[PDB]
Design a protein around this nucleic acid. Structure first.
Ligand SMILES: Nc1ncnc2c1ncn2[C@H]1C[C@H](O)[C@@H](COP(=O)(O)NP(=O)(O)OP(=O)(O)O)O1
Ligand SMILES: [Mg+2]
Length: 427
DNA sequence: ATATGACGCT
DNA sequence: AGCGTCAT
């Protein structure tokens, strides 16, 4: 048993949307900025935030007019909004630049607009053989941080720290035994400096990464050292790091389950999960959660890097909160249309680029009096890439919710509308 | 009154 | 198929 079988990495762009705005507005470069969505209610919900604006304390979800309370220098690059909602075309088109690069190395799995898991297992056996045993040098890793080094019997500069830390790791390394989990992790951490350096080469976009043995730890190390650096995380640094690591951090456990993992066990850290055996664990969460949250605090997860760049489900959403809420037949046709037209714009730019037709179409709504993000999923075969079809397709599918005799309006007002095309074909 | 996309379960 | 959960 090891869980050091694979080598897996998680690259991720340092404040992506800011970087995409900055490559057209040079005034934004080396300046503390955010990126705002719409512009009326509190100036617009801030989604992306530069790192110079973070050092004044500006957060996402925060409302533009409220960071302009925290941040005077907050040169605010507005998101392009179109058809009344969002238009994220600047970025979804950049994101597809960045993932072309990363696949020149290993077959990755798209994980966000801005990040991608990548399995480097095969290509590590590529480089390791290309080595006759020629030890790996520091120069090859100009920006890699080694979790848990330096140490033992022991400058102040953050970047001298990084040298004498990289320098310890390499010296204790079995450059011959091509099977050591810390020699494969280490070749792999090169493919990623070369991956990430060629990104900023071909895009001007800056990335950070994280490189352990599974995917939950690749992420946990991506965001250790940021921005513009990587971090290898050894299966031996795992017990160290995991010990002060909050359960709420780990991918899956950020939510309701997290609390129960914490509450039901009486815990606050990943490392304290070690003491409960697996079938022991399974009795409080399930047959799959115990099998998982056991080997997790042992830095063993076996979620595979699922080979996928072009996603599934093309989707287009628009909220109508509070006083906006649509209560009118005529409204819920125009918004359905304007939603059905951006889908039309996205779905074509799919079909030529990616060789697939979606056959499904999922309408959703929310009502002025529900908390659930969605209060009704309803579905109907997408046959033709027509807005006016999809628009009128989608009214038939939902009309049967208007609790009214007033067919002049809508009872009760809708606070959300969502069109999503799933079940792509081979076109 | 913060727009997307995935997945496990039923 | 639809809904809850979770991540960004
Ligand atoms: N709650 C949210 N809602 C909508 N969009 C969001 C979002 N959070 C992030 N984004 C959008 C905006 C973001 O530009 C994009 C990816 O942002 P991140 O992966 O969350 N973190 P970033 O790459 O920005 O910087 P760093 O990694 O150093 O934290 O997704
Ligand atoms: Mg991210």
């Amino acid at each position: 048993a090891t869980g050091q079988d694979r080598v897996v990495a998680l690259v991720d762009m340092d404040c992506f949307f800011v970087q995409v705005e900055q490559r057209q507005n040079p005034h934004l470069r080396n300046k503390p900025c955010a990126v705002v969505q719409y512009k009326s209610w509190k100036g617009g919900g801030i989604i992306a935030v530069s790192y110079e604006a973070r050092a004044f304390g500006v957060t996402r979800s925060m409302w533009a007019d409220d960071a302009k309370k925290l941040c005077p220098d907050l040169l605010l690059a507005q998101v392009r909004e179109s058809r009344g909602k969002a238009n994220l075309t600047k970025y979804r088109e950049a994101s597809v630049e960045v993932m072309e690069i990363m696949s020149r190395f290993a077959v990755i799995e798209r994980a966000s607009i801005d990040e991608a898991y990548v399995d480097l297992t095969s290509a590590v056996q590529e480089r390791l053989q290309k080595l006759q045993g020629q030890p790996i040098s520091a120069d090859l890793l100009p920006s890699t941080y080694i979790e848990g080094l330096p140490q033992g019997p022991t400058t102040v500069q953050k970047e001298g720290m990084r040298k004498q830390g990289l320098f310890q790791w390499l010296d204790s390394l079995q450059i011959d035994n091509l099977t050591s989990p810390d020699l494969q992790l280490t070749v792999g951490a090169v493919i990623v400096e070369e991956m990430r350096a060629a990104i900023e080469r071909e895009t001007g976009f800056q990335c950070s990464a994280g490189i352990s043995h599974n995917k939950v730890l690749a992420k946990l190390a991506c965001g250790l050292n940021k921005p513009n650096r990587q971090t290898l995380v050894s299966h031996g640094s795992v017990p160290q790091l995991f010990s002060q690591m909050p359960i709420r951090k780990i991918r899956s456990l950020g939510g309701k389950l997290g609390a129960s993992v914490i509450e039901i066990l009486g815990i606050e850290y990943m490392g304290e999960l070690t003491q409960f055996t697996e079938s022991q664990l399974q009795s409080h969460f399930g047959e799959k959660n115990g099998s998982w949250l056991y080997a997790m605090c042992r830095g063993i997860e076996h979620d595979p890097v699922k080979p996928r760049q072009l996603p599934k489900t093309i989707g287009c959403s628009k909220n109508f909160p509070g006083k906006t809420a649509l209560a009118t037949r005529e409204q819920v046709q125009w918004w359905l249309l304007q939603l059905a037209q951006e889908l039309e714009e996205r779905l074509t730019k799919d079909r030529n680029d990616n060789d697939r037709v979606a056959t499904q179409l999922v309408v959703s709504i929310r009502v002025q009096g529900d908390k659930r993000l969605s209060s009704l999923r309803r579905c109907c075969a997408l046959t033709r890439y027509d807005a006016h079809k999809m628009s009128h397709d989608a009214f038939t599918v939902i009309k049967n919710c208007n609790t009214s005799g007033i067919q002049t309006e809508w009872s009760p007002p809708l606070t959300m509308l969502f069109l999503c095309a799933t079940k792509f074909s081979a076109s």
